[PDB]
C-alpha cells in the first residue's frame, strides 16, 4: 500500500472490504527448521525469565526502549513481576520468549513474545497466539530488524502447529479488524497537570479541577470485596457467559482465569460483588502499569491503572466502574485508563473520562473476516 514487509504476509490489504471468514492461506505441512539470519554481530537467544538476571535485562530493554506517547514525554515501565505474569501464563513455551543479543557484549537489543490463547472470532474458535513486547533498541531502529523478529516468531509458532495470531498496535498496518480509542480518567489532577500529561482548562481553575475529579473515600456497592481462591470458578462462569455477546473474545480455561484474575499486588486487582445471599454476581478488574516521565527532574513516574474485564449481571456497570475509580484512587493511582471496547462507551463520558491521542488497532494474522465496531471487541491485552 505500499508495505515492503506487510505486503508479503498472509493478511488482507488495506481498503479491501472483506465479506468472507477464514484463513488467508492453508496450514503449512513443512516448516523451515533453521532460524532466520540476523545482521552480522547479532545472535538469537531464548530468554529464561525464571532467571532473575535475564528478567531484569528484559525489564531494562523495555524500560529504556519500549512504547512512548506521541509527544515523546512518557514511556511504559512494565515491572519485572508484571512481565512474569504477562509472559508465563498457562501453556507458555520457552522458545516463544525470543531475544536478540550483541554477540560480543551480550547486550540485549531486541525482543518479541508469543503466548498461547484460544480465540473466538465470530462463529469460529481457533487456537492462536498473542504477540506482544516487540522491541528494538533505539540505536538499532530503521534497519529492518523488526521484520526478522516477526518472521522468526512466526516460524517458531508454526513448529507448534499454530497458524493464526492476534495482536494490537498504535500504528496502521494491513488490516485492522477493529479500531479502539484510549480514554483517561484523572485521579490526581494536580500531578497530571504538573507533569503535563494533562492541561488546565482556560475555563477551569485548579481548585475547580480538583473538585470536578474528587471521589468518595470508599466504594458504594454492597458486598464488594477482593477476589479469593474460592471465587475462581464463579469468576470463570461469569466471564464466559458475559463474553458471548462480543465478536472477538478470549476463551479461557479455569486455570487461565486463576492466572489472569487472582489478585497480585502491584500487578492485577480483581474485586467481586458477593450479595446478601452469599452469591458472587459481578466483578471488576484492573492491571497496574506505571509510566516513566522522560527527562523530568522531580516527577519520575506516573502510576496508571488499566481497565481489564468488567462483568455485570446484577450491579449496574456504571456503579461497578465508579467503584473501580474509587479503589484505584485508594491504591494511589494517578490516572485510570480504559478503551472504548465492550460496553465501555456507556460509562466513559458519565464518569468524566476524557479522550486521548491515538488509536489502538486490533489485528489478526492469517484470518480474513469482516471488521467490527469497538463495541463488538471483547479482548483486552497487556
Dist. CA 21–CA 90, nearest whole Å: 29
3-state secondary structure of 326: helix
Q: Which of 204, 246, 274 is nearest to 376 (CA)?
A: 246
Contact 367, 23 (CB under 8 A): yes
**Binding of residue 58 to ligand MYA (CB under 6 A):** no
| Cβ partners under 8 Å of residue 265, min gap 6 | none
**Binding of residue 291 to ligand MYA (CB under 6 A):** no
Query: Residue 100 forms beta bridges with which residues?
Result: 44, 110
Query: Among ligand MYA, ligand 096, none, what binds residue 75 when CB lies within 5 to 8 Å by partner kind?
Result: ligand 096
Dist. CA 310–CA 323, nearest whole Å: 12
Binding string, residues 263-292; x marks residues near ligand 096 by CB under 6 A:
----------------------------x-
Residue 270 grid cell: 480483581
Minimum gap (Å) between residue 76 Cβ and ligand MYA: 8
**Binding of residue 64 to ligand 096 (CB under 6 A):** no
**Binding of residue 91 to ligand MYA (CB under 6 A):** no
Minimum gap (Å) between residue 178 Cβ and ligand 096: 16
Peptide bond into 175 cis (omega under 30): yes
Dist. CA 320–CA 188, nearest whole Å: 20
Dist. CA 360–CA 207, nearest whole Å: 33
Q: Which of 162, 118, 18, 111 is nearest to 379 (CA)?
A: 118
Question: For ligand 096, which residue of 58, 153, 252, 302 counts as binding (CB under 6 A)?
Answer: 302
**Binding of residue 129 to ligand MYA (CB under 6 A):** yes
Dist. CA 127–CA 104, nearest whole Å: 39
Binding string, residues 162-201; x marks residues near ligand 096 by CB under 6 A:
--------xx----------x--------------x----
Q: Closest CB to ligand MYA among 141 and 214?
A: 141
| Cβ partners under 8 Å of residue 47, min gap 6 | 54, 55, 57, 58, 97, 98, 99, 108, 111
Dist. CA 38–CA 258, nearest whole Å: 38
Known binding residues for tetradecanoyl-CoA: 4-6, 133-136, 142, 144-146
Known binding residues: 4-6, 133-136, 142, 144-146
> Where do we find the cell 513486547?
133
Query: Among ligand MYA, ligand 096, none, what binds residue 134 when CB lies within 5 to 8 Å by partner kind?
Result: ligand MYA
Q: Which of 233, 333, 332 is nearest to 283 (CA)?
A: 233
Size of the site for ligand MYA (CB under 6 A): 33
The number of residues making up the chain comes to 382
Question: For ligand MYA, which residue of 13, 143, 225, 241 counts as binding (CB under 6 A)?
Answer: 143
Question: For ligand 096, which residue of 335, 339, 342, 348 counts as binding (CB under 6 A)?
Answer: 335
Among 168-176, 289-297, 321-329, 340-348, the segment contacting ligand MYA (CB under 6 A): 168-176
Minimum gap (Å) between residue 30 Cβ and ligand MYA: 15
Minimum gap (Å) between residue 90 Cβ and ligand MYA: 19
Minimum gap (Å) between residue 264 Cβ and ligand MYA: 23
Query: Among ligand 096, ligand MYA, none, what binds residue 357 when CB lies within 5 to 8 Å by partner kind?
Result: ligand 096
Q: What does the binding site for ligand MYA look like in residue numbers (CB under 6 A)?
A: 3-6, 66-67, 129, 131-136, 141-147, 150, 153-154, 157, 162-165, 167, 169, 171, 173, 365
Amino acid at each position: 500500500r505500499s508495505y515492503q514487509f506487510w505486503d508479503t504476509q498472509p493478511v488482507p490489504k488495506l481498503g479491501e472490504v472483506v465479506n468472507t471468514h477464514g484463513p488467508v492461506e492453508p496450514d503449512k505441512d513443512n516448516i523451515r527448521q533453521e532460524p532466520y539470519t540476523l545482521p552480522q554481530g547479532f545472535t538469537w537467544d531464548a530468554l529464561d525469565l525464571g532467571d532473575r538476571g535475564v528478567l531484569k535485562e528484559l525489564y531494562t530493554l523495555l524500560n529504556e526502549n519500549y512504547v512512548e506517547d506521541d509527544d515523546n514525554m512518557f514511556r511504559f515501565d512494565y515491572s519485572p513481576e508484571f512481565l512474569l505474569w504477562a509472559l508465563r501464563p498457562p501453556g507458555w513455551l520457552p522458545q516463544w520468549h525470543c531475544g536478540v543479543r550483541v554477540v560480543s557484549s551480550r547486550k540485549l537489543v531486541g525482543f518479541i513474545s508469543a503466548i498461547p490463547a484460544n480465540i473466538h472470532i465470530y462463529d469460529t474458535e481457533k487456537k492462536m497466539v498473542e504477540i506482544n513486547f516487540l522491541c528494538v533498541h533505539k540505536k538499532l531502529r530503521s534497519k529492518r530488524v523488526a521484520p526478522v523478529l516477526i518472521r522468526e516468531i512466526t516460524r517458531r509458532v508454526h513448529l507448534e502447529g499454530i497458524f493464526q495470531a492476534v495482536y494490537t498496535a498504535g500504528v496502521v498496518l494491513p488490516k485492522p479488524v477493529g479500531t479502539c480509542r484510549y480514554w483517561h480518567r484523572s485521579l490526581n489532577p494536580r500531578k497530571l497537570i504538573e507533569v503535563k500529561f494533562s492541561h488546565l482548562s482556560r475555563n477551569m481553575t485548579m481548585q475547580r479541577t480538583m473538585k470536578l475529579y474528587r471521589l468518595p473515600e470508599t466504594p458504594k456497592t454492597a458486598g464488594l470485596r477482593p477476589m479469593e481462591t474460592k471465587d475462581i470458578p464463579v469468576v470463570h462462569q461469569l466471564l464466559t457467559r458475559y463474553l458471548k455477546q462480543f465478536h472477538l473474545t478470549p476463551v479461557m480455561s479455569q486455570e487461565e482465569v486463576e492466572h489472569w484474575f487472582y489478585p497480585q499486588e502491584n500487578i492485577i486487582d480483581t474485586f467481586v460483588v458477593e450479595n446478601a445471599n452469599g452469591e458472587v454476581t459481578d466483578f471488576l478488574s484492573f492491571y497496574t502499569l506505571p509510566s516513566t516521565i522522560m527527562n523530568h527532574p522531580t516527577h519520575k513516574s506516573l502510576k496508571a491503572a488499566y481497565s481489564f474485564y468488567n462483568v455485570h449481571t446484577q450491579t449496574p456497570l456504571l456503579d461497578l466502574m465508579s467503584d473501580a475509580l474509587v479503589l484505584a484512587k485508594m491504591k494511589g493511582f494517578d490516572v485510570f485508563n480504559a478503551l472504548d471496547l465492550m460496553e465501555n462507551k456507556t460509562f466513559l463520558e458519565k464518569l468524566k473520562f476524557g479522550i486521548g491521542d491515538g488509536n489502538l488497532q486490533y489485528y489478526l494474522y492469517n484470518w480474513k473476516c469482516p471488521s467490527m465496531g469497538a463495541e463488538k471487541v471483547g479482548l483486552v491485552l497487556q
